[PDB]
Amino acid sequence: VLPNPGLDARIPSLAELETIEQEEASSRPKWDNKAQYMLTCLGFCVGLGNVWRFPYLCQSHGGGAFMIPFLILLVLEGIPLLYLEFAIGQRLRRGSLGVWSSIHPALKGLGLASMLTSFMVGLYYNTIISWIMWYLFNSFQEPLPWSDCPLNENQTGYVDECARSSPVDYFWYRETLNISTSISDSGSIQWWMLLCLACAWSVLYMCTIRGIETTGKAVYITSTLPYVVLTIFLIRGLTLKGATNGIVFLFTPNVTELAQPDTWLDAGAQVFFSFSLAFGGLISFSSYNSVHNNCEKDSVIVSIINGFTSVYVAIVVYSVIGFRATQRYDDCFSTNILTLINGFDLPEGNVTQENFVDMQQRCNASDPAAYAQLVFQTCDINAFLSEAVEGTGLAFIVFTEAITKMPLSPLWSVLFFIMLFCLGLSSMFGNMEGVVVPLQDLRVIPPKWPKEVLTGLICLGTFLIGFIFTLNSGQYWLSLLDSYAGSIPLLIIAFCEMFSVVYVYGVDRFNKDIEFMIGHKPNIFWQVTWRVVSPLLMLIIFLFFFVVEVSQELTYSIWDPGYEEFPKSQKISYPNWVYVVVVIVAGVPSLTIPGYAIYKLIRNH
Amino acid sequence: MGVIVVGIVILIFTGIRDR
Ligand SMILES: *[C@@H]1O[C@H](CO)[C@@H](O[C@@H]2O[C@H](CO)[C@@H](O)[C@H](O)[C@H]2NC(C)=O)[C@H](O)[C@H]1NC(C)=O
Ligand SMILES: *[C@@H]1O[C@H](CO)[C@@H](O)[C@H](O)[C@H]1NC(C)=O
Ligand SMILES: *[C@@H]1O[C@H](CO)[C@@H](O)[C@H](O)[C@H]1NC(C)=O
Ligand SMILES: *[C@@H]1O[C@H](CO)[C@@H](O)[C@H](O)[C@H]1NC(C)=O
Ligand SMILES: *[C@@H]1O[C@H](CO)[C@@H](O)[C@H](O)[C@H]1NC(C)=O
Ligand SMILES: NC(=O)CC[C@H](N)C(=O)O
Structure with missing residues (x-):
């Protein structure tokens, strides 16, 4: 292992922990009961990640x-990292x-x-949640x-955009987003999205006014309501026409798709995005538990519950599809x-349906002229399932279209969207703690201020930065950044x-x-998974990312209401300047890990 | 909107209170 001289005398040496435990209670917060801790860790690991990314990540790669690979990596790459994180944090x-x-x-830079x-x-x-x-x-x-x-205006014919396509696609693309035709066409700020964005951020700020001791009271409902609404929706879904079809x-995989690096890279990215690891x-x-809290139990429990919850959500979504x-x-x-x-x-x-081909043959052989001039549609089952759903266009295009076909539609819609909103808050609690705590650790604010002012400042800054997703071209920026x-x-x-x-702390x-x-x-x-297998799998995934990134064109989908063959969205290439933004969103959070280190290698020389 | 801002004000004032 690497030397790291002086690791001792900077870490508690297991002889004080039995006494240091009863010492930080006066200034550092602590959990009310183990139920709150387990429920918060569970709610942080479920929501808006297997409802939106998992569906079309399954679709674009052949469904099954x-x-x-997702499950193989959840068994061999997720659980040991969960255990490692819990153990060092405790x-x-x-x-x-x-x-x-x-x-x-x-x-230190790694933490940054x-x-x-x-x-x-x-x-x-908090853009997605706004839309919800x-x-x-x-x-x-x-x-x-x-x-x-x-x-x-002439109240006799439909609007052409809503006529050539579905009404749900119209309400999504024109009445909610008012989407433009390209990423180079930015427009107004579209007030009717600012209200929703401000409401989302205000609720989030309300729940995390003080970190723990305030989110620990909302988690009881926020991480519980989804597991009831989802059971109701599963029971309602498994009795429809296309369910079980x-x-x-x-669950019918094709062995010719498993050999592409893209699918394995996406599986790795998804198994790291599902469990909130590296966040x-x-x-x-x-880091709030006592020093004697069993760790294997909680790691295994969280991993199993999360895996099976992901499977249930996938089953429900594909039932509706x-x-x-x-x-x-x-x-x-x-x-x-x-x-x-x-x-x-x-x-x-x-x-x-049964005798269609026979009647078709008879009517042709009877009068070839009148039959040949007719126009037919060629379309079969197990071919509309392959209709690729775009980003953030599954929870709003297929679920609303299926809810509008059931009795008492408003109740179903309210339940579905309150479930999604609860999942969103359940995740944003941890996504806000992850920024609130390090900023306090950096001594950026004087201790004289209360925590309420720092949380408010963070929420205000992020709300003011989040204007970009309220323009006429918001969804394009969102997909690019995601x-x-x-x-x-x-x-x-x-x-x-x-x-x-593993190889520095020992x-x-x-x-x-x-x-x-x-x-x-x-x-x-x-031990066998820590010291051997997990680094190899993560290195292979890291290499496959670069293997699949280069040698493929960057394209995004546009609406273009004035374009022929309109009902199908078009694909175009990103302009040349956008490679700046990617470097600022994927380069800086990744290049900071070596960068800062270099600084120290120069500072302490 | 009204009720949530009410919650915000009550919570932050609850602070100055128990502070
Ligand atoms: C598994 O993948 C193969 C190849 O990627 C699929 O075979 C092609 O499927 C497309 C549409 O899905 C057809 O247009 C092609 O004609 C098929 N090619 C051949 C040689 O048959 C296959 O359909 C996929 N299976 C599943 C279940 O997704
Ligand atoms: C509506 O009626 C007017 C005549 O009053 C006609 O000029 C116009 O074309 C009609 N609109 C459509 C969409 O046909
Ligand atoms: C939608 O956008 C267009 C152009 O950006 C604008 O003219 C129109 O007023 C917008 N819709 C509404 C309801 O304002
Ligand atoms: C359809 O009409 C033809 C006309 O003779 C008849 O022979 C046939 O039985 C009809 N189909 C059925 C299912 O009865
Ligand atoms: C219709 O019948 C004619 C008769 O010879 C045949 O040549 C043609 O292929 C048939 N076409 C269809 C679509 O049934
Ligand atoms: N970064 C996060 O907020 C984690 C989200 C979580 N993995 C989920 O999708 O449910």
């Missing part, structure tokens, strides 16, 4: 080809900077990266606004039968974290500390 009695600034101080990432996701997340808030307010009216098209599309949240939330696909296929076939019977004037109840803000850092930070813990000190804490040295599985 994304679920095998043993070192420090936040997200302390546990890395106290191990070869030239690693975490903080910076916990900011780059903030601006992202909007969709939550537009309920409470029986003729739901996304159920029918509006009429133009759209679930199989999720600096858990390493700090676990299968229902939608079966509906559209039935529409195809009904329209084709209607055209056929309108052509030759056949009896109404004679042409059906394609890169959560892929490279959540790999590099995690790898540096595990390498630091794994033997770690084993002795675990023995002193819980009562036995970890099982052989933990």
Whole structure:
């Protein structure tokens, strides 16, 4: 292992912890009961990550080809990092900077990266939630606004944009977003999104006014309501038409898709984005426990609950998607039968699904001319399931379209969107703690101020920066920033974290500390996965990222209402300047880890 | 909006109180 001279005399040496435990109680906060701690760690690890990213990350990679590597990596890459994070956060009695600034101080920069990432996701997340808030307010009216098209000035024909496409797509792209035609077309600020953004940030600031001791009172509801609303929705979904016909599309993998580096890279990124690893949240939330709190139990419990929750959410979402696909296929076939019977004037109840081809053949062989001039639609089941859903366009395009087809639609809509909003707050609690704690650790503010002013300043700054996603071109910026803000850092930070813990602090000190804490040295599985397999898998993922990044064109989708073949969104290439923004969103939070270190290698020379 | 700002003011004043 690396030398790191002087690691001792900067760390408690297990002879004081039994007494230091009863010493920080006066100034450092502590949990009310273990239920609050476990429930907060659970709520931090579930929400708006397996409802939005997992669906189209399954779709774009063939549905079932994304679920095998995801589980292999959740077993071999997630659990040991959860355990490592909990253990060091509990043993070192420090936040997200302390546990890395106290191990070869030239690693302090790594901590900064975490903080910076916990900011780059903030601006992202509280935009999504804002949209949800909007969709939550537009309920409470029986003729739901996304159920029918509006009429133009001449109140006899529909608006052409809503006529050539669905009314839900119109309400999403024109009445809510008012999206433009390119990323180079920015417009007004669109007041009717500022209200929702301000409401989202005000609620978030209300819940985290004091960190722990105030979020620990809201978590009881916030991390519990989803597991009831989701069970209700699962029961409602598994009894539709396309259910058990759209679930199989999720569990029929194709062995030709597993050999692409893209799928494995996306699986790694998703298993690091599901568990909030390398975010600096858990390493700090676990730093409030007593020194004798069993750690394997909580790590294993959180991992299992999170994995099975992800599987249940995927099942529900693909149930609804299968229902939608079966509906559209039935529409195809009904329209084709209607055209056929309108052509030759056949009896109404004679042409059906079973004997369609026979009647088609007869009507051709009878009168070739009149039959040839007809127009047919060619469309089959298990082919509308492959309709790729764009980013952030699943929870608003398919679920509203399926909710508008059920009895008592307003109740279902209110329940669904309050569930999503609760998941959002459940995640933003930790995503805010991860920025609040390091800033206090940096002595940026004088101690004379209360914490309320610092939290308010952070919320105000992030709200003022979040204007960019309220322009006419908001969704494009959002997708651009999301394609890169959560892929490279959540790999590099995690790898540096595990390498630091194992091969700098020394794994033997770690084993002795675990023995002193819980009562036995970890099982052989933990050591075999710490010292051998996990660094190799993370290095392979890190390399595959660069293998798949270069040699593929960057393209994004646009709406273009004035473009022929309109119902399908178009693809175009990013302008040349945008490679600046990526370097500022994916380079700086990742390049800070070596950079700061270099500074020390020059400062202490 | 009203009720949530009410919660904000009550909480922050609850502070000065118990402070
Ligand atoms: C698994 O992947 C293969 C290849 O990537 C898929 O085969 C192609 O599927 C597309 C549409 O999904 C068709 O247009 C091609 O004609 C297919 N190619 C061949 C050679 O058959 C396959 O469909 C995928 N399977 C699943 C379940 O997603
Ligand atoms: C509406 O009616 C006016 C005549 O009053 C006509 O000029 C116009 O084209 C109509 N609108 C549409 C969309 O057809
Ligand atoms: C939508 O955007 C267009 C152009 O950006 C603007 O003219 C229009 O007024 C906007 N919609 C509303 C309701 O203001
Ligand atoms: C459809 O009409 C033809 C006309 O002779 C008839 O022979 C046939 O039985 C009808 N189809 C069914 C299902 O009865
Ligand atoms: C219709 O019938 C004619 C008769 O010869 C045949 O040549 C043609 O291929 C048929 N086409 C279709 C679409 O049934
Ligand atoms: N950075 C975060 O807020 C973590 C989110 C969490 N992994 C989820 O998607 O549920």
